[PDB]
Design a protein around this ligand. Structure first.
Ligand code: SFJ
Ligand code: OPX
Length: 658
């Protein structure tokens, strides 16, 4: 259909533009679509881009508006006092502000559908809300509407929500256009999606991105595919991967690197209201926080992640049990059988389930997928699905049988309810992943697993050594393998904070010299240095010049392959803010060869200081551009839970950063 109105290049400079004469007599019927291309790189705290209002005294609550906040939130109001209707729909973190120094042209599509009684908002090709109501209010059937406005809402003759920005294009249609038609509207996005709602993972949410550039030039990414909203474990979460063979321009359909089947892979719209938003999947096993490295020796790609048994997360994991029994300098996974009060079993060589009370083997074995076999035959359990049909979260059996896994709630044999680390490998650079194996405990029988630092592991230039940073109370625990991940040893490095989420990432400054940058509880990013390929570690220092919150955020870090200003360069990615996870920056540091000190010389702002930026992944692409995959929202904020399609990917050149 044709638009009933189309206009453009409106500058909103804290003074509204009246388009009543052009628009109001064109509005007809009860369904409308608004399409708007706009920029706002310096928005006011709360501002309206478009308004339709009754501007008369006594009718201040009769208006429709499309509004935004300087947090990046988008929303609408639809109000009529005579009808007794006051709708407010919005979603945080829906907008872009600036990219590479330039204001971003956001593409907004709002559909008001009287027949389905549904209001739907898309921004930049992403559906940010879709709300169905019992009593529908058509946006141009509000009582006594007499003003159509850009850059404010006229209430009782005064300009409310004055906007700073520009509306380069605005069209309106007397029709609710289909999702199909919506997808044909050209976009001007500065980003792309790798993982997204509706893809092969069927997770509606994603967090904890990684990126790693392989020797073939293929670029690999991993992520938490989070099913039960954006919550950390306990939940249902799988690890998914995708790769690009063309310097990040296009990405493969995701596959799983690590997955559990005890719960169905459901795409669910997790509730965001204050009563239900903390609803949390409570009986599923999960994986969380992945990290990738490539091994020179075998050519294999290696991926580690934390593993949580059914209903377990960092909050309730048994801190005083590794889940393994030491028997002769060897560690065996402990198991509890249905009905026993203690763990009277172990998994020994070739997966034989052994009875500890009698040191007899049983007729049970554990296969390579940690599935239970009796006499060589597969045992099964019934799968669960989740729903909010009753008005609160329910988890119930769905009729489907899946292989019985020792990490499952319904298993005959169950592992210790604590956290573990697993590894899987790929022989084809991420086209398929092997079945995962658990790493051994590194801090003794009576200490829970360390926590893997998400991002990249480190492959040293001059050897086959592989290192993965992990953290626990009071230290960083580096996991080191010299044999393609077949065996591991730890190298502990004390840090002066207890209870820190000390997520750490490493760069090799020069041969055998490793600097680790890590999250702390001090509001500053810290670092330590090894000069013997991770064997021993220095005291902890801090970076001034970058601020984090008291709780901190993951920091990603790479060593750039090319000189910058004639010097070796390190690039950090992190929010730069004392207040929240926002103000994303890449920070370029030049190395002083005299003492390996780093002078942080350039700060590139990824978007506005007030727009969200949390966990991130960076990697040097084979063409020497920088790829960044990041959480574009505040993943700490309890107001920004359960948002879809906020983990986004951008491509930057060094000239953009300097
Ligand atoms: C293993 C685990 O639970 N890792 C998660 C991350 O995946 C991330 F999600 C994050 F929460 C965060 O700071 O955002 O950190 C932790 C965690 O939930 C808590 O912060 C601390 O218990
Ligand atoms: O130097 S590596 O540790 O092998 C690595 C890749 N380097 C290439 C060198 C050539 C340009 C692309 C990046 C850096 C880490 O961030 C991982 O991406 C792997």
């Amino acid at each position: 259909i044709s638009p009933i109105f189309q206009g453009g290049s409106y500058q909103l400079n804290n003074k509204s533009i009246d388009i009543s004469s052009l628009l109001l007599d064109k509005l007809s019927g009860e369904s409308q679509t608004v399409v708007m291309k706009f920029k706002a790189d310096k928005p006011n705290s709360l501002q309206a881009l478009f308004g339709l209002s009754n501007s008369k005294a006594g009718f201040k609550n009769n208006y429709f508006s499309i509004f935004m906040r300087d947090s990046g939130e988008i929303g609408v109001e639809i109000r009529d006092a005579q009808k007794g209707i006051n709708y407010l729909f919005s979603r945080p973190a829906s907008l872009w502000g600036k990219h590479k120094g330039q204001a971003v042209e956001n593409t907004l599509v709002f559909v008001s559908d009287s027949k389905d009684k549904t209001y739907t908002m898309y921004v930049n090709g992403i559906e940010v809300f879709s709300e169905t109501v019992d009593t529908f209010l058509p946006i141009s059937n509000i009582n006594g509407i007499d003003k159509a406005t850009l850059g404010a809402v006229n209430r009782e003759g005064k300009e409310h929500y004055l906007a700073k920005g520009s509306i380069d294009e605005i069209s309106l249609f007397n029709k609710a256009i289909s999702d199909q038609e919506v997808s044909t509207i050209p976009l001007s996005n500065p980003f792309q999606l790798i993982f997204q709602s509706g893809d092969s993972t069927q997770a509606n949410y994603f967090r904890i991105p990684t990126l790693y550039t392989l020797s073939s030039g293929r670029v690999l990414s991993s992520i938490d595919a989070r099913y039960g909203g954006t919550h950390d474990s306990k939940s249902k979460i799988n690890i998914a991967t995708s790769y690009s063979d063309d310097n990040g321009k296009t990405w493969s359909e995701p596959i799983f690197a690590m997955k559990f089947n005890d719960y169905e892979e459901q795409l669910v719209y997790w509730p965001r209201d204050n009563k239900l938003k903390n609803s949390q999947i409570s009986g599923s096993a999960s994986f969380i926080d992945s990290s990738i490295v490539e091994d020179k020796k075998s050519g294999k790609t290696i991926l580690l992640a934390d593993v949580m048994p059914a209903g377990i997360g960092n909050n309730n994991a048994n801190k005083a049990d590794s889940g393994f029994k030491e028997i002769n300098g060897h560690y065996y996974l402990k198991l509890k059988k249905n009905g026993d009060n203690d763990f009277r079993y172990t998994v020994r060589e070739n997966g034989v389930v052994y009875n500890e009370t009698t040191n007899k083997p049983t007729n049970y074995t554990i296969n390579d997928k940690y599935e239970v076999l009796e006499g060589g035959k597969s045992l099964t359990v019934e799968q669960y699905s989740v729903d909010f049909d009753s008005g609160s979260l329910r988890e119930r059996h769905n009729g489907k049988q899946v292989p019985m896994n020792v990490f499952y709630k319904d298993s005959l044999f169950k592992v210790t309810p604590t956290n573990y680390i697993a590894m899987t490998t790929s022989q084809n650079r991420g086209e398929s992943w092997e079945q995962f194996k658990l790493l051994p405990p590194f801090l003794g029988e009576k200490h829970n697993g360390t926590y893997l630092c998400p991002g990249q592991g480190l492959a040293l230039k001059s050897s086959n050594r592989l290192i993965f940073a992990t953290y626990t109370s009071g230290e960083l625990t580096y996991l080191i393998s010299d044999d393609s991940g077949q065996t591991w040893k730890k190298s502990s490095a004390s840090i002066p904070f207890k209870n820190a989420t000390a997520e750490a990432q490493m760069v090799e400054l020069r041969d055998g010299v490793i600097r680790t940058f890590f999250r702390t509880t001090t509001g500053k990013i810290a670092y330590m240095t090894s000069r013997d390929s991770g064997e021993t570690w220095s005291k902890v220092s801090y970076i001034d010049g970058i601020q984090q919150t008291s709780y901190g955020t993951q920091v990603s870090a790479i060593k750039y392959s090319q000189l910058i200003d004639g010097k070796e360069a390190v690039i950090l990615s992190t929010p730069n803010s004392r207040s929240g996870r926002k103000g994303g920056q890449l920070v370029v540091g030049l190395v002083n060869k005299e003492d390996d000190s780093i002078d942080w010389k350039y700060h590139y702002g990824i978007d506005l200081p007030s727009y969200g930026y949390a966990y991130s992944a960076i990697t040097e692409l084979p063409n020497h551009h920088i790829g960044v995959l990041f959480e574009k929202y505040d993943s700490w904020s309890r107001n920004e839970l359960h948002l879809s399609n906020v983990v986004q990917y951008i491509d930057l050149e060094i000239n953009d950063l300097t």
